[PDB]
């Protein structure tokens, strides 16, 4: 009787994903993850302790964020002992923040949090940020309270005025002030103050936070942006780099001012212009071109085919596991459905079918 | 406040502060302004986010907390004092700050003072301890008892404020001023001692309430509505996102900077299906060892070329003298700084930038000549044994610099000429 | 101007002072 | 070390093969290629005892799981050869003849889209299937006849990029064999460079046995101790959307993110209709200010 429970669970899951929309979603991102390292995360209540798992999950989050969206800079400020401590400036290299987080590994989480100080200096760090960049902050929190020097509502008003959004991933339960932050910052939405139920749910939440977010019509910033593809050289001689001032065998060359750099996707240090590859911009095209869900045909009706169109395996036989791409009119197995919907980003049935 | 570009450029003390924090910043700044004489405003003009980050790092302060509650009495007692917590006590209790400042710089020592403080009954009163005449306290600290009492009265006077009638229990109990009933129970009324006086639990409870009020008014610092208050949001319309979807019209330009026929391909197709059903031999695939030898030549040539590519797969190890290595790295660094500032001036595009562009052009020319003179030095220091490698190492930044000079000259001829 | 000059000269002393240190 | 799951996709198309053999004179060059690939799979399955091979052909109207047979008897080849080699070769020549007979049957309808990306994606799915079953090296082989008319790679570009990203996730190099008049195929060369794949283009159907026996034998068991033989280098640039030429420094939409070598007419996005800001584009059009 487990298949009926699985079916009704899949129905209640798919009721949320019935509506799939091609919203304009931010690509030039600006993501900040502040960390609290206080007495609360010293609890071993989840194995091994909250501090260790948020360290590991932040490592994964950095990797996933830079993989999916390499067109953003990442800054991390830790919270400790009534002080918020900047440990990671916004940068194109994830490895810097990886090393900073590795430093955060060995140190000891202790103290009390101050979202006022944390968000204030996060605002100040987010101040010299260009218009197209979408300023947004992830906040992790384990306390049920917050010691603060002054008002939080002035900070809330300033953050709303400066067009920065937040998303809170609280640990224990809901905190009303964090709900207020999420609602007021997020145009009244309640889809940003999220509480886990276990570590797997925390993993899923982090994966959810990886994704780009849609933007609002009223928050209109539709413009152009100057861009430059550089050229890579492979020279015999080591050559001084502009950024780190040291001898480099290879390195890309600046398209505009003909200097050289060491890493991409990065902006020029000399002509001060952003340099990318077409792979980097095409990386988010699945977000730009979403994929429709695939429908299982019912077991009662007559079937177009009895084996999987894509992976080429036999469909198993009570119910019918034939997920149909209505855009290509072909049914598929669950494994192929998962792979095409998540790993792949094209429908080979729609590739074979001519338009 | 201290947030404008002008304020950040003005704070010379903060500039010196993060200067003294770094060491390569003395190196860079010394070469930039001490050695090259660049305008230090334009030096700091790039490092404005770093300056603001340093300022905001230095600028934060903690929130209030119950420091006396965190004080523990801990046989004997050994003082283990923390200066930040001492100042926390000072800020939380200006009476204790005053008692420090009129006694320690006048009469006795700081650890002696804090031993007297922990001995004092004023400490117990300010903490969550009921005062007792069995305790003797410290007389010097306990002279401040009435001063703290009148501080409490003045603070309560400040803390008084009018109350909203929506929640005013005083208005609630002033509903009926002529309630004539019976005297309520001793159990539920505030109990007293035998002689009618109170024990003082009402005093300690109003004191901790005063602590709460002081904390919330510290929050409420420098740094009608009931219609909104009584809204029942549970029976209201759900909020829906106004996020805009996006379509995509698709019309791409063809790639810019003989035709086969169905009959002919069908004829060839018929012929090759005939050949396919006719025969297929794996053994004929073996080549003629001469055109195959040319294939060997091509393959081996590709291997040699890409192997020489792979032959040049901390920086690289070099046989430079270390001092000259540092000097040339320094010259490369300051040349890069000059070039970046010149590009900042050039891409700015103002007539106000013109003298700056000219002067940085002169500085770039000077850097060019100094690079050449350095090349003369490594010339007569090596006999061009590795002075060639020195020139090649400093080459690409020089090429970019002189390209920028040519660009400046060309735009000068474009506009002026 | 003139009053900016002693400020830089103060920075001149501090730069020299940090050099020996 | 481990069995290398061999992935071979053969792009068969009479529009290319007829063009190549009419341009030259080597009729049955595709047959020569097939025999060479037969020897290649023999050499691979003799290099390791279990390095299983996936063989898929993409015809004009779609793709076909050649090896193995579907989940739902003459012998042209010799009886003296090996058992497994003979089984695979007989199966493939039977499948090839069936596909060619089918292609002769439905020759007269028109489909102008290349199916290479879809074949590559389906092969990658099958690579996931094989690797998820039971540790196996993933190495993808494409055979193409590049002498045909380069019609439009524009719609092929995006799923090719997606396939590149997937193989990057899957540590599968994409090794390219091209036979055609055109020396260069930019997207394939970029694919090889990004995926650490091998690009190679020649023209003569002879000597491909020595060519892809020598060069096209790199396995992940010994990839870092073998220098790649590719000589070309790619800028990873794309042609412009409205002028069709590659751009070094340019402009992209904040929303659609398509390359604009110049200002779009009407200052509106030619991809997603976003009207832009005139002061922004005037600042972009600003000349530098030079002293007189
Ligand atoms: Zn570098
Ligand atoms: Zn540049
Ligand atoms: Zn399947
Ligand atoms: Zn489909
Ligand atoms: Zn657009």
Primary descriptors:
part of a larger assembly; 4 chains; B: 417 residues; mainly alpha; 61% helix; C: 21 residues; 1 helix; binds zinc ion; transcription; Transcription. POL II; General transcription and DNA repair factor IIH; TFB1 isoform 1; Transcription initiation factor IIE subunit alpha
What does this structure look like?
The structure is cut from a larger assembly and holds chains A (355 residues), B (417 residues), C (21 residues) and D (292 residues). Chain A has 355 residues and is an alpha/beta fold. Chain A contains eleven helices and 16 strands. In chain A, the strands form five sheets. Chain A has a six-stranded mixed β-sheet, sandwiched between helices. In chain A, helix 6 (176-185) links the parallel strand 5 and strand 6. The longest helix of chain A has 19 residues, at 50-68. Chain A is globular. Chain B has 417 residues and is mainly alpha-helical. Chain B has 20 helices and no strands. Chain B has helices at residues 5-10, 12-21, 24-35, 40-46, 48-59, 67-70, 83-92, 94-101, 110-119, 121-126, 139-142, 145-159, 169-173, 201-219, 225-229, 262-278, 291-310, 322-348, 354-382, 387-415. The longest helix of chain B has 29 residues, at 354-382. Chain B starts with a helix and ends with a helix. Chain C is mostly helical and 21 residues long. The longest helix of chain C is centred in the middle third of the chain and has 19 residues, at 2-20. Chain D is built from eight helices and eight strands. In chain D, the strands form two sheets. Chain D has a six-stranded mixed β-sheet with strand order 3-2-1-4-5-6, sandwiched between helices. In chain D, helix 6 (186-194) links the parallel strand 5 (174-179) and strand 6. In chain D, helix 2 (29-47) runs parallel beside helix 7 (208-214) and helix 4 (116-132) runs parallel beside helix 5 (154-170). The chains are: A alpha/beta (355), B mainly alpha (417), C mainly alpha (21), D alpha/beta (292). At the B-D interface, helix 16, helix 17, helix 19 and helix 20 of B face helix 1, helix 2, helix 3 and helix 7 of D. Strand 7 (224-228) of chain A pairs antiparallel with strand 7 of chain D. The PDB classes it as transcription. Keywords: Transcription. POL II, transcription. Consensus map of PICdeltaTFIIK form1. Chain A: General transcription and DNA repair factor IIH. Organism of A: Saccharomyces cerevisiae. Chain B is TFB1 isoform 1.
What summary fits the major beta sheet of chain A?
6 strands, mixed
Task: Give me the secondary-structure category of chain A.
Answer: alpha/beta
As an assembly, this protein is: part of a larger assembly
Structural class of chain C: mainly alpha
Which small-molecule ligands are present, each listed once? zinc ion
Radius of gyration of chain A: 24 Å
The total of helices of chain C stands at 1
Compressed to H and E, one letter per element, the order of chain A equals: HEHEEHHEHEHEHEEEEEEEHHEEEHH
Biggest interface: B-D, 60 and 62 residues
Fraction of residues in H or I helices of chain A: 25-40%
């Amino acid at each position: 009787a487990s298949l009926v429970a699985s079916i009704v669970e899949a129905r209640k899951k798919r009721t949320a994903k019935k509506n799939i929309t091609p919203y304009q979603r931010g690509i030039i991102r600006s993501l900040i993850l502040t960390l609290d390292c206080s007495e609360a995360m010293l609890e071993k209540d989840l194995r091994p302790n909250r501090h260790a798992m948020i360290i590991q999950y932040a490592i994964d989050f950095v990797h996933e964020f830079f993989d999916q969206n390499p067109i953003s800079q990442m800054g991390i400020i830790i919270m400790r002992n009534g002080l918020a401590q900047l440990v990671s400036q916004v940068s194109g290299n994830p490895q810097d923040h990886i090393d900073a987080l590795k430093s955060i590994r060995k140190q000891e989480p202790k103290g009390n949090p101050s979202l006022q100080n944390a968000l204030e200096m996060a605002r100040g760090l987010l101040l010299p940020v260009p218009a197209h960049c979408t300023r947004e902050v992830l906040i992790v929190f384990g306390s049920l309270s917050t010691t603060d020097p002054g008002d939080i509502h002035q900070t809330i008003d300033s953050l709303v005025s400066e067009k920065i959004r937040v998303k809170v991933l609280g640990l224990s339960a809901q905190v009303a002030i964090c709900k207020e932050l999420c609602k007021a910052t997020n145009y009244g939405d309640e889809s940003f103050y999220k509480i886990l139920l276990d570590e797997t749910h925390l993993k899923e939440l982090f994966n959810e936070a990886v994704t780009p977010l849609p933007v609002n019509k009223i928050n209109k910033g539709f413009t152009l942006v100057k861009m430059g593809f550089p050229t890579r050289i492979f020279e015999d001689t080591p050559t001084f780099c502009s950024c780190h001032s040291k001898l480099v065998y290879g390195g890309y060359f600046c398209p505009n001012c003909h200097s050289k750099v060491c890493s991409l996707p990065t902006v020029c240090p000399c002509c001060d212009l952003m340099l990318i590859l077409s792979t980097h911009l095409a990386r988010s095209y699945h977000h730009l071109m979403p994929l429709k869900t695939f429908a299982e045909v019912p077991t009662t009706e007559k079937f177009r085919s009895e084996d999987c169109f894509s992976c080429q395996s036999r469909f198993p036989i009570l119910t019918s596991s034939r997920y149909r791409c209505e855009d290509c009119k072909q049914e598929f197995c669950v494994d192929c459905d998962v792979f095409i919907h998540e790993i792949l980003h094209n429908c080979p049935g729609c590739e074979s079918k001519p338009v | 406040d201290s947030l404008s570009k002008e304020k950040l450029l003005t704070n010379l003390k903060l500039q010196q502060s993060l200067l003294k924090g770094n060491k390569v910043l003395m190196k860079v700044f010394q070469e930039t302004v001490i050695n090259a004489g660049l305008p230090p405003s334009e030096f700091w003009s790039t490092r404005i986010p770093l300056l603001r980050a340093f300022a905001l790092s230095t600028s934060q302060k903690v929130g209030p907390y119950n420091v006396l509650s965190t004080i523990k009495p801990v046989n004997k007692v050994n003082v283990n004092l923390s200066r930040e917590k001492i100042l926390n006590i000072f800020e939380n209790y200006p009476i204790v700050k005053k008692a420090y400042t009129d006694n320690v710089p006048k009469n006795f020592k700081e650890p002696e003072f804090w031993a007297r403080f922990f001995s004092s009954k004023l400490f117990r009163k300010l903490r969550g301890e009921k005062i007792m005449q069995n305790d003797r306290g410290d007389v010097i600290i306990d002279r401040y008892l009435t001063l703290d009492q009148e501080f409490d009265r003045k603070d309560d006077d400040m803390l008084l404020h009018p109350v909203k009638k929506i929640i005013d229990l005083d208005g609630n109990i002033q509903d009926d001023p002529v309630v004539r009933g019976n005297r309520p129970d001793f159990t539920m009324q505030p109990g007293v001692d035998i002689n009618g006086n109170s024990d003082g639990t009402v005093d300690i409870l109003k004191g901790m309430n005063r602590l709460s009020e002081k904390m919330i008014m510290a929050l409420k610092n420098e740094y009608n509505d009931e219609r909104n208050e009584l809204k029942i949001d549970d029976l209201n319309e759900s909020y829906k996102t106004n996020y805009a979807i996006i379509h995509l019209k698709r019309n791409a330009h063809e790639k810019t900077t003989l035709k086969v026929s169905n009959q002919q391909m069908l004829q060839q197709l018929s012929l090759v299906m005939d050949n396919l059903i006719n025969k297929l031999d794996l053994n004929q695939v073996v080549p003629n060892n001469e055109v195959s030898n040319k294939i060997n030549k091509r393959v081996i040539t590709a291997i040699k070329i890409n192997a020489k590519q792979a032959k040049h797969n901390l920086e690289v190890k070099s046989t430079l003298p270390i001092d000259l290595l540092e000097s040339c790295r320094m010259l490369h660094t300051t040349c890069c700084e000059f070039l970046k500032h010149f590009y900042i001036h050039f891409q700015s595009g103002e007539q106000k930038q013109a003298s700056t562009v000219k002067k940085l052009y002169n500085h770039l020319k000077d850097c060019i000549e100094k690079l050449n003179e350095l090349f003369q030095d490594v010339l007569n220091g090596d006999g061009e044994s590795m002075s060639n490698t020195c020139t090649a190492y400093l080459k690409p930044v020089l090429n970019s610099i002189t390209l920028a000079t040519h660009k400046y000259d060309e735009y000068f001829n474009e506009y002026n000429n | 101007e003139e009053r900016e000059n002693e400020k830089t000269l103060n920075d001149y002393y501090a730069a020299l002072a940090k050099k020996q240190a | 070390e481990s069995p290398s799951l061999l992935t071979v996709i053969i792009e068969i198309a009479p529009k290319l093969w007829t063009t190549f053999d009419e341009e030259g004179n080597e009729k049955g060059s595709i047959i020569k290629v097939l025999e060479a690939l037969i020897v290649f799979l023999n050499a691979h399955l003799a290099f390791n005892s279990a390095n299983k091979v996936a063989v898929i052909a993409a015809y004009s109207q779609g793709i076909k799981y050649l090896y193995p047979e579907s989940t739902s008897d003459l012998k042209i080849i010799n009886s003296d050869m090996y058992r497994r080699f003979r089984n695979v070769d007989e199966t493939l020549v039977e499948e090839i003849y069936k596909l060619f007979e089918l292609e002769k049957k439905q020759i007269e309808q028109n489909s102008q889209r290349s199916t290479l990306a879809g074949a590559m994606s389906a092969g990658l799915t099958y690579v996931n299937r094989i690797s998820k079953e039971s540790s196996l090296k993933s190495r993808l082989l494409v055979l193409t006849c590049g002498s045909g008319s380069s019609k439009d790679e524009i719609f092929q570009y995006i799923p090719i990029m997606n396939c590149i990203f997937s193989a990057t996730k899957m540590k599968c190099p994409i090794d390219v064999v091209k036979i055609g008049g055109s020396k260069e195929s930019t997207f394939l060369q970029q694919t090889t460079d990004a995926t650490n794949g091998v690009y190679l283009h020649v023209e003569s159907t002879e000597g491909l046995i020595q060519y892809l026996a020598t060069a096209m034998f790199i396995d992940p068991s010994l990839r870092p101790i073998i220098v790649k033989p590719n000589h070309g280098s790619v800028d990873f640039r794309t042609s412009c959307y409205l002028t069709g030429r590659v751009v070094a420094v340019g402009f992209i939409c904040s929303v659609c993110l398509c390359v604009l070598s110049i200002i779009p007419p009407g200052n509106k996005c030619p991809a997603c209709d976003s009207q832009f800001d005139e002061h922004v584009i005037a600042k972009l059009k600003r000349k530098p200010v030079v002293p007189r």
